[PDB]
Amino acid sequence: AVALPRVSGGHDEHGHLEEFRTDPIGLMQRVRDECGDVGTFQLAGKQVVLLSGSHANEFFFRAGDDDLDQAKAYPFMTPIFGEGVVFDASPERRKEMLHNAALRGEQMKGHAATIEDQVRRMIADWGEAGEIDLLDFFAELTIYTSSACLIGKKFRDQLDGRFAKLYHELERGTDPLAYVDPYLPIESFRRRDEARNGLVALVADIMNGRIANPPTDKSDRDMLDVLIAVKAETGTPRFSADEITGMFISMMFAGHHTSSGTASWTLIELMRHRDAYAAVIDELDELYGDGRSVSFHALRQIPQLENVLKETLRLHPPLIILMRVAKGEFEVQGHRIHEGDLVAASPAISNRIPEDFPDPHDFVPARYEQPRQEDLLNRWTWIPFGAGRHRCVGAAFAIMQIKAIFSVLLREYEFEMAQPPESYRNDHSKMVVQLAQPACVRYRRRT
C-alpha cells in the first residue's frame, strides 16, 4: 500500500496532534507547502488527508454522503450534543438539530428585529464611554440572539450571563485529543461535563419556575412550555431537564461561536482599517436615512459592510478545518484515499492561496466589488462557509445577523482599539476556535 505524502515533524506522543493544538494553521500550511494539493498529517491514531487547491477541494465538497461522511468526523461534538435530540426520528442531523425551520424565510424579518433588540439590551448600560472585551461581549450577545431566535424570546428572557459562562466552558471542552477519545480523563473534558451539568440545572430551574406560575395567556407559550407539557404514557412528564437542555444546546451551537468570533473580527478589522470603517458609517447613516427599521435593512443590501464581512471571513474563518470520513477508496490527483481515512479541507489555508487571492494576508474588501468578485470566481477556494453538499445552510442568517448587529452598534457608538492592533488573535488550542483574551476595545457615543 503506497504511502501518501506526509508533512515533516509529528514526532510528539500523538504524532502531529500536539502541534495541531498549538499551531494548527502553521501546521496545515506546511502540509501544502511540502506536500502540495494532497498531503497528510497524523492526528493521534488517525491519519488526516488534507486537501488544498481548487481541484482537490472540489472533489471534497461535491462528494456524496455515501463517499465522504461528515457524521463521525467531529467526535468532539458528541459530548456537547449528548443523547440524540429530543425527537427520535432517523437522522435528525441538521434536520432537527439545526432545523432550517428556525432560519425559515418567513421568520427572517422577525429574527432581524429580535437581533436588534438583543443588541440594544446588551449596550443598554454602556453610558457615554467605557471599555469592553470582545469575547465577553460577543459571546454573551450571541447566546441571547441564538436562544431568542432558535428557541424563544420568553426562554432567552430567563437567561443571564451565567448561561454564557457555562456554554463557553462547554465549547472549550473540544481539545483535539477528542480524536483519541472525547471522554478521556482530561481537565477540560471534566470542566466540559461539569459545565453541561450546570446548564441542565439552569434549565431545570426555569422549568420549575414556569410550573409554579404558568402564562396568563395561552398564546405566549414558547418551545419550553410545549416540551414541559408533553406527557408520557402514564401521565408522567416525557422529557427530563437533561433531555430538553441537550436539545437546546444542540440547536444553539450553530448560532453561537461562529457568529460570535465573526462579529468580534468584523469590528477588529474595521478598527484596523479606519478607511473601510468610515465607508461603512457613511453607508449606514445614508441607508437608514430612509426611516426603515433594522429588520428592513438587515435583509437587504449594505454593500460596504458586506464586503468588509466577506473579507473578515476570508482571513478569519471560524472553522479553520472541515472533516469527513472516507467511506470508500478514491483517487485525487494520483493519490489514493482509503476507507476509514479522515479527509479534510481547510478554509484557513485555502482562503489565502496566493494564486487565487492577490495579497492573501491583506484586508481588501474591494475583492468582492463589481470587478474582481473573488468570492464568486474562486467557488472552491473561497470557503468561509464551506461549499457544495454541506455548504453552510445558515449563511444567509449569519450575514443578516452581522448586518443587524452592526447597524445598531456603529450608529450608536464609535470604537477604538485599546491594545496594539496585532495583539488581537484567536485561540486555536481547541477544535472550537475562540477569540483570545484580552480583546479590549474603547467606545464613546456618536454625536
Q: Interface with ligand TPF includes 253 (CB under 6 A)?
A: yes
CA 219 to CA 43: how far, in whole Å? 52
Q: Which of 63, 134, 319, 337 binds ligand TPF (CB under 6 A)?
A: 319
Is-contact 385 391, C-beta < 8 A?
yes
Which listed option, ligand HEM, ligand TPF, none, makes contact with residue 253 (CB within 5 to 8 Å by class)? ligand TPF
CA 159 to CA 3: how far, in whole Å? 53
Q: Between helices 395-412 and 303-315, what is the axis angle to 10°?
A: 110
Helix (H, G, I), strand (E, B) or coil at 163: helix
Q: Interface with ligand TPF includes 308 (CB under 6 A)?
A: no
324 is in an annotated binding site: yes
Residue nearest ligand TPF, CB atom distance: 98
Q: What is the CA radius of gyration of the chain?
A: 22
- The count of residues interacting with ligand TPF (CB under 6 A) is 13
* Beta bridge mates, 344: 50, 323
Question: CB of 113: closest distance to ligand HEM in angstroms?
Answer: 16
Element (H, E) at 331: strand 330-332
Q: Between helices 134-150 and 161-171, what is the axis angle to 10°?
A: 100
257 is in an annotated binding site: no
Is-contact 189 183, C-beta < 8 A?
yes
Q: Interface with ligand TPF includes 94 (CB under 6 A)?
A: yes
- The footprint of ligand HEM (CB under 6 A) covers 70, 94, 98, 103, 254-255, 258-259, 262, 317-319, 322, 347, 384-386, 390, 392-394, 397-398
Q: Interface with ligand TPF includes 396 (CB under 6 A)?
A: no
Of the listed pieces 40-48, 250-258, 290-298, 331-339, which binds ligand TPF according to CB under 6 A?
A: 250-258
Compute the C-alpha angle 38/383/30, nearest 5°. Answer: 35
What x/- string results for residues 342 through 381 when contact with ligand TPF is judged by CB under 6 A? ----------------------------------------
Question: CB of 191: closest distance to ligand HEM in angstroms?
Answer: 25
Is-contact 411 107, C-beta < 8 A?
no
Question: CB of 431: closest distance to ligand TPF in angstroms?
Answer: 6
Q: Which is nearer to ligand TPF, 207 or 313 (CB)?
A: 313
Q: Which is nearer to ligand HEM, 398 or 408 (CB)?
A: 398
Q: Interface with ligand TPF includes 25 (CB under 6 A)?
A: no
Question: Which are the contacts of 190, defined by CB distance < 8 A and separation ≥ 6?
Answer: none
Question: CB of 317: closest distance to ligand HEM in angstroms?
Answer: 6
Is-contact 405 263, C-beta < 8 A?
yes
* Beta bridge mates, 443: 130, 415
Q: Interface with ligand TPF includes 254 (CB under 6 A)?
A: yes
Question: CB of 391: closest distance to ligand TPF in angstroms?
Answer: 11
Q: Cell numbers at residue 318, please?
A: 471560524
Q: Interface with ligand TPF includes 60 (CB under 6 A)?
A: no
Residue in this structure with the C-alpha cell 497524523, named with its chain if needed: 42
Q: Which of 86, 97, 123, 396 binds ligand TPF (CB under 6 A)?
A: 97
CA 12 to CA 25: how far, in whole Å? 18
Helix (H, G, I), strand (E, B) or coil at 61: helix
Of the listed pieces 38-46, 109-117, 139-147, 253-261, which binds ligand TPF according to CB under 6 A?
A: 253-261
Residue ranges for the known binding site for heme b are: 70, 74, 95, 324, 390, 392
Binding site for ligand TPF (CB under 6 A): 74, 77, 94, 97-98, 253-254, 258, 319, 392, 394, 431-432
